[model samples]
Target chain A: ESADLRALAKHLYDSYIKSFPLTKAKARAILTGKKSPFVIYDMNSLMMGEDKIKFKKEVAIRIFQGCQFRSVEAVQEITEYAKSIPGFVNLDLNDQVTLLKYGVHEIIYTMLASLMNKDGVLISEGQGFMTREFLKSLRKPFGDFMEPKFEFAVKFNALELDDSDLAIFIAVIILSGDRPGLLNVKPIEDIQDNLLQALELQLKLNHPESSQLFAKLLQKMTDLRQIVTEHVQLLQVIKKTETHPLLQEIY
Target chain B: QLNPESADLRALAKHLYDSYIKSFPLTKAKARAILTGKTTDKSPFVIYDMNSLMMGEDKIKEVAIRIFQGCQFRSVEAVQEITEYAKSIPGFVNLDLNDQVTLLKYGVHEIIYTMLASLMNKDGVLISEGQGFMTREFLKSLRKPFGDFMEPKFEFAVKFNALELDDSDLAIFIAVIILSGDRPGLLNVKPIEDIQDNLLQALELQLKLNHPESSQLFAKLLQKMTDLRQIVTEHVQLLQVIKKTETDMSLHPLLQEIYKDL
Candidate 1:
């Protein structure tokens, strides 16, 4: 159980991180708070523009579009990752849908934290990094909802868990058996337990000098739960107030 | 060296758990009765349209206050029970009093919901000492905001009960919840970690001997801990929303302290 789980975790890390492919220079730039060269209009400029009202609307639309696109990519990746788990695909279809609906946001944010540095997360396939400030500049509702996540992401990055740790963490989040509508929870719970045991073992091996690492990771899951709960409430508000097609569909 | 089926240990575990449930009886009766009341102090009982906008602000404030009180009363009761149970554990009292308080403070809800799952069956949760059964259908039919508050918990509870753990399993599981090493602050982490590790190993062994047919039972049990954490987080979120939107309703000081940081 441990061997196969470890191999699968390593495979997941390789597939996810290798696909994203961040260079050392880009990572340094992100860490050093370097702004992307491709800024079309600073948010301040938009707020101060002649058509400020229109620009505000434009800002909402652009922020929504960018966030939705990235979120879709994340949801797709998370869905595939869920299927890669040993017994996840065999569960009832309704259970799969339920898990994906509830679990995807947490998975996305978990991965986002992994991909992020102190400064911000890489976006547009590394063409640019969207800073925390930029995300906060998004207009009302969108900006308000996003600020909590960025705050969480910055703190999560402080833990400095590597790709392997993140792969197991993401798997743990996806394999959660508490998603409300599982037909046969025991099997999924069993799988999650295996993943958790594997994660604990790997953390010990990977961070031998840091005894508090596993405990800290588990605490972060609690924090992640809090963050995701707020995110869900925010999404409900967005659902009630907005008419974006992508938001409607994903939600 | 181990006998999971020992009568003495089983009886002790049952006694401890019974104390937990007895101290914190489900607040469904209180909720139903209060919700049945109406606008003025001595008004006749009426079905509360929990989502009624036509009702006056005072009426709305009254309903919110009742809901808030129900939540806080049950929350504090469970906290009191968990405090006693933590004291019952060996070596628990030797720890710093502040650490003991902190552990109980953070872990009360996790243990509350874990035991809540134990009280559930396929029919629904056994509430008000079995006089009241909150069926899944009835709960689902409840109007929004209130229904949203409860549905996730029932959803989790139903599946969690499917694990079919015995009291022996719960005994160690409750200990694990109380002695969680992951809680934010600890004056001495190593001792807490040591106790948790021992309880974890004991749990693994007990599961092996008790459920010999199911090799993976141990993992499923541990996974429920994670599930419990998720459910409690959602519960806290619900409380936060109520507190934020219904500013007129006063929250208890203890409840306020729990959600203060989150």
Candidate 2:
């Protein structure tokens, strides 16, 4: 734990996991029956007709826009993290885009756990708790698209993974060999396998009693691939205004 | 050999282990590492001796229904052993009657889903009372949200089984599931939670004893249980969708009760 991987983990953690706005503990407390300390954004108070429809769309827009800044920051964070590694930036630039295009969604969804628990998701950093029901209440197609993600988030949080663990999972997601249309599979695979070894090495040190921790987390990698894809299809139908370019070029 | 009532805890684990195995005896193991790929077709395994074969022609909803129903029926046996084992857990018999029922009602599907991995892998799950094979390919057509869940549960089993827990660890795991203070209704939250704390402690010790080479097994198991919680939540919704998809079918009172929507 003291050599190359240790320093790498510390670096990755400082850049990404360290920057998260809320602690997983507070997030879990929010999921528990604690009273909200911040403003609440609930849809349950509204009815199902025009009022609800308009409210949902407004809610959808607000939520999307709320995430807009952090979303771009995520790309910046991700790119910097990728570039920090020796092999990641070496490939041709479009090849970089190819990996990021498929990988970003997975990384975003992976981090979504920090903002969510089984009861609801956090919005505006630690400022509010949206009840799970209300989030589900937002009309489909145009909104309430977060159910799949919450499901992923809840299970991932169960793994009790931390910033350091997430750092590697994010790296693995970006450097995946299977991302659609890769021109740099061999180099990317080499990098990913090394990343995987680092993760395995870390898990043993961090979680020694659990023989299957490494394998189960990898399974989550596969799980995200599907959920992220499904979310995009759901994302496509929502009509939009000018959007965050690096983020949701859902233009 | 550990906790204060440690002797008692040991027996409880052993007793539940016996119950678990009796319910789903180790007739075989598939040891699946993955559930999808071109490798599986007609999967070298058992076909449903029950009516499952007849229902196989499919839609995602319909296929998922048959899959859920087949397990639902098999789960009846698992749930029975689960209850019998619950009564042996010291405080379980003394808990509020309705609370006991509430716990099992919510907990059984989750426990069954986890135990289902005993015959699962990355490739497939065993069916037909453990006499058959059901490939992940067959499960491919499941409905969108449920599919989101169905495939993932298969992954849990694959990796969870990789830990190679014996009947004893699973028995304790199932106890932890039933005794969860988190289940929807409970008049005696503290007591049930205490029971859960004890069971979790016992499970952890047992993992340490059983798999000394692995230090993180308990936390990892906890993670899978968390994953199981989501899968069973999806399980309820999947059932409702299945029933609505078929219009009407023979769902037992237990499933109707356990998975019912308000």
Candidate 3:
């Protein structure tokens, strides 16, 4: 019963990530070079006293657009992955939306850490990688907003979960029965638990150095949930307080 | 009262109100005073009222019952109230009844925590009929066995309360929680999700119009749904801990069903 589930998870682990054209080596190269696509600025030096307000708006828009592009692509990728899961499409169409709406960003952030090294996430295709320091300096609500996700991603990345691990992780997150309006929770829960057991078994084999990896990973799910909460809060602030057409659609 | 057409809503409100009055009798002013940390009364934890206790095995039973009642009873009452409120929504009753129950079973705790956030202030939960406020400090002191269970919720409640949503905001939010459409088993997802979307749109419009001062209010309120989920997950974990650790205390069947898998 569980063998097929693990087998599918393993296949998904490969294909879903492969769906994103960017490879780990490519992500590293883009992030490390001097003229990376990410546009970093020293706020104080760039925006003088009078120009500060104008620059603030410009920076917010830029940051929102940058993150928006990455987020949208991620959502699209996950939505495709979501549809392919055997029982996912069979769920209520609205339920599918609920899962995507609530689960996507968290899934994105979970996977987002993969694009990060010690510094920050790669924001643009081959052009920009926003460092954590640069993100913090952006300005008020936007600066404050982006940090929590990065913080979470940093910790999640610390776990050093490989592709196979993330494949199982994505399965667990997507199939979460805890989402508000799931119609057939039992089946979803069964799938999630089977995936969880499989992940534990795989983790035992994969990360022999870390005895507590499975436990740590489960706690990371909780951490991911918390990060999503912050992201949603930030999105709400941006959606209502600021203007970003791209961010609007993703929400 | 918002949906006067539904008798269930009317009854639920009346029933909950009566239960509130019966369990913790206190004036609105008094409740406010306690929640705002203005009451002069000594901490409830400091005094074990002898009068409240009975003799014999009754004491053991009484302590256990009080422990059970004080903690679980509020949630039961909350779930009952929210269920009726959900049923009263325009198209909610129209959903297949099993779907309704499934939604209720899963989402009740979320509703309860959200409501609790509203009722809470910086100090502690406004609990009991109005016997007195349970101080956050006292709850924290109890530690892992139970205190750990409530600490995170109190933390969340304090932050959520900062949003300052009114009853109307809460009513719509509650409706959104109920009509979430994501509950495990549902006969029709479209209608439920449609109801949820309508509520979201209504909530957005209301927040936009009413809270023009804070544009993020709608998003913030929506965000609380996520916060509510995290808090309830911890609460469920707490219940599981209690069920597993306390063999002496009997577990409620309903609670067992809810926390079955931990």
lDDT of 1 by residue, B1-262 (tens): 5465454445544554554444444433333333344454423222224443223223423443554465468667667766776777666789888788778777878887877665454444444333333454544455455557666677677777666675557766788788875576778866887777565555655677678887557656665566677777677777777767767767778767776664
As for candidate 1, its clashing pairs are none
lDDT of 3 by residue, B1-262 (tens): 2444344434433443443334323333454555555435522222123333333124222343454556776676666667666656778888888888777877778877776765556666655544434556656655357657667777787777777766556666667677765455677877886767555556655566557786345534554566777777667666667767877766656756665543
- Per-residue lDDT over A75-137 for candidate 2, one digit per residue giving the tens place of the 0 to 100 score: 666676677765887887888989887777778888778778777776545555565676676
Can you rank all candidates by DockQ, best first?
A: 1, 2, 3
Off by over 4 Å in 3: A1-6, A23-57, A239-251, B1-229, B232-262
DockQ of each: 0.09, 0.06, 0.02
Q: Candidate 3, B172: how far from true, in Å? A: 41
Clash counts per candidate, in order, are: 0, 16, 19
Query: How close is every model to the real structure, measured as TM-score?
Result: 0.63, 0.56, 0.48
Highest lDDT against the true fold, candidate = 2
| Winning candidate number (DockQ) | 1
DockQ of 3: 0.02
Looking at candidate 3, what is the lDDT of residue A51?
40
- Please give, for residues B1-262, the per-residue lDDT of candidate 2 as tens digits: 3556767767767776666666554422323322222355423343332344454333112455556676667777777867776787769989899999898888888877777777676756766544356667556555553355457678677667777787778878888778876466678887986777677667866887889886456655664665676576556666666567667566878767777642
Q: How do the candidates rank by lDDT, highest first?
A: 2, 1, 3
